[PDB]
Amino acid sequence: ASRLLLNNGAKMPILGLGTWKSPPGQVTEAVKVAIDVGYRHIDCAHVYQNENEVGVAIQEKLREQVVKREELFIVSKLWCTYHEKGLVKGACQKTLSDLKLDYLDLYLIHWPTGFKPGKEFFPLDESGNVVPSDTNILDTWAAMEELVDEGLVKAIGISNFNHLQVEMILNKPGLKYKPAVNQIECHPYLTQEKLIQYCQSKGIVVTAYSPLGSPDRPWAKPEDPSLLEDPRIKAIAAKHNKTTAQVLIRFPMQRNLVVIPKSVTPERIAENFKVFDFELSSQDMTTLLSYNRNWRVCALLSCTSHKDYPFHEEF
Numbered sequence: 139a140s141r142l143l144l145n146n147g148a149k150m151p152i153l154g155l156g157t158w159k160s161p162p163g164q165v166t167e168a169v170k171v172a173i174d175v176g177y178r179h180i181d182c183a184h185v186y187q188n189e190n191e192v193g194v195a196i197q198e199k200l201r202e203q204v205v206k207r208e209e210l211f212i213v214s215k216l217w218c219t220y221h222e223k224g225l226v227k228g229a230c231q232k233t234l235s236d237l238k239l240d241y242l243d244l245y246l247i248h249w250p251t252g253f254k255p256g257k258e259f260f261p262l263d264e265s266g267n268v269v270p271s272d273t274n275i276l277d278t279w280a281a282m283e284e285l286v287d288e289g290l291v292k293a294i295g296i297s298n299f300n301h302l303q304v305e306m307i308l309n310k311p312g313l314k315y316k317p318a319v320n321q322i323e324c325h326p327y328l329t330q331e332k333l334i335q336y337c338q339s340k341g342i343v344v345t346a347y348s349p350l351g352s353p354d355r356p357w358a359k360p361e362d363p364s365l366l367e368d369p370r371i372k373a374i375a376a377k378h379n380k381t382t383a384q385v386l387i388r389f390p391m392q393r394n395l396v397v398i399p400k401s402v403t404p405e406r407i408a409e410n411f412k413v414f415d416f417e418l419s420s421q422d423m424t425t426l427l428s429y430n431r432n433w434r435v436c437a438l439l440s441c442t443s444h445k446d447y448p449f450h451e452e453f
């Protein structure tokens with residue numbers, strides 16, 4: 139279905155527009171186009187450095203009466219340099235001010251790893267490594283919880299958490315709110331079966347990020363495997379008279395995951411939305427699952443030493 143029910147009673151659109159790497163100068167138009175096309179979910183983050191320009195778009199479409207605020211699902215994310223309890227609210231309000239909203243539909247802990255607070259998104263020490271902060275997930279969660287009580291955000295969740303980190307929150311003594319969502323990298327080369335099964339079992343909705351394999355991530359190398367150019371996936375696409383992107387978007391949807399493909403390109407924003415009028419076969423789904431290779435595009439490998447580095451566990 140086009141929306142999934144969250145554990146807070148809200149309906150989250152299963153298709154949203156990603157905005158990482160969307161430059162300030164193109165993201166306003168992208169969001170306006172997406173909304174015109176019918177997207178009702180935008181995935182944002184402070185660290186994407188474009189929330190102002192996302193805000194401008196939403197304001198215009200509200201003013202044009204193309205959409206109402208309550209038909210939109212806006213997500214943002216608390217960056218790693220703000221995990222200190224006392225900094226969480228300020229970060230949230232700064233995001234709200236930039237987006238020009240009164241509330242977020244969903245606010246996530248962007249990554250489990252706290253970094254040193256300050257002006258830099260990735261504060262480096264003299265060795266050129268990221269500097270951790272003395273912060274922990276449960277205290278950051280407590281501060282996220284307070285945002286709900288204040289009505290700044292309708293829902294809270296986590297992103298890039300492994301199952302033990304999730305369990306830690308679920309088992310917190312005095313827990314006020316379970317995570318609504320865990321947003322994780324997910325595509326045919328990283329199919330995430332075990333963490334998906336775990337989260338779904340707990341009533342936590344999974345959002346699949348980098349569904350097209352993030353070919354525009356700054357660090358892509360030419361030898362890196364490429365989902366959009368995989369001939370196996372094109373053949374499945376051709377069979378439905380759809381594009382490879384459309385298949386890659388449809389795939390998570392049929393696993394009951396939310397998916398958030400990024401484009402600044404109007405024609406592709408439009409293409410990516412045309413995923414409600416076809417269906418992958420159960421054989422197609424099996425096949426796409428068989429392509430897993432535990433290939434991960436977002437992993438900041440030098441953070442392996444951080445106590446909260448998520449990707450040591452099997453899931």
Ligand SMILES: NC(=O)c1ccc[n+]([C@@H]2O[C@H](COP(=O)([O-])OP(=O)(O)OC[C@H]3O[C@@H](n4cnc5c(N)ncnc54)[C@H](OP(=O)(O)O)[C@@H]3O)[C@@H](O)[C@H]2O)c1
Nearest residue numbers: 156157158347348349350351352354383399400401402403
């Ligand atoms: N929670 C997290 O830690 C996290 C991590 C990564 C991503 N995310 C979220 O997930 C979103 C999506 O992931 P992503 O941005 O890494 O990458 P992605 O959506 O897998 O891929 C985006 C890339 O695919 C291209 N593209 C889009 N539609 C296409 C189509 N129909 N045909 C061909 N190329 C197409 C885009 O080109 P153009 O823009 O040039 O059209 C862009 O280079 C992000 O933007 C962000 O919102 C979250």
Ligand SMILES: O=C(O)Cc1nn(Cc2nc3cc(C(F)(F)F)ccc3s2)c(=O)c2nccnc12
Nearest residue numbers: 260262266267268357434435436437438439440
């Ligand atoms: O490490 C590489 O060679 C490229 C690469 N980069 N990145 C992004 C970043 N990598 C870094 C690395 C540093 C640091 F300076 F090494 F600490 C500081 C900030 C960042 S942001 C990944 O997340 C990433 N994840 C998986 C694989 N490669 C990468």
Ligand SMILES: O=C(O)Cc1nn(Cc2nc3cc(C(F)(F)F)ccc3s2)c(=O)c2nccnc12
Nearest residue numbers: 158185186249250251436437438441444447448
């Ligand atoms: O975080 C996102 O939503 C996408 C994104 N990913 N990456 C790769 C990253 N990978 C990681 C990995 C960790 C980890 F928790 F240590 F594993 C912590 C922070 C990061 S950031 C960037 O370097 C990055 N840099 C700027 C903006 N966005 C990103």
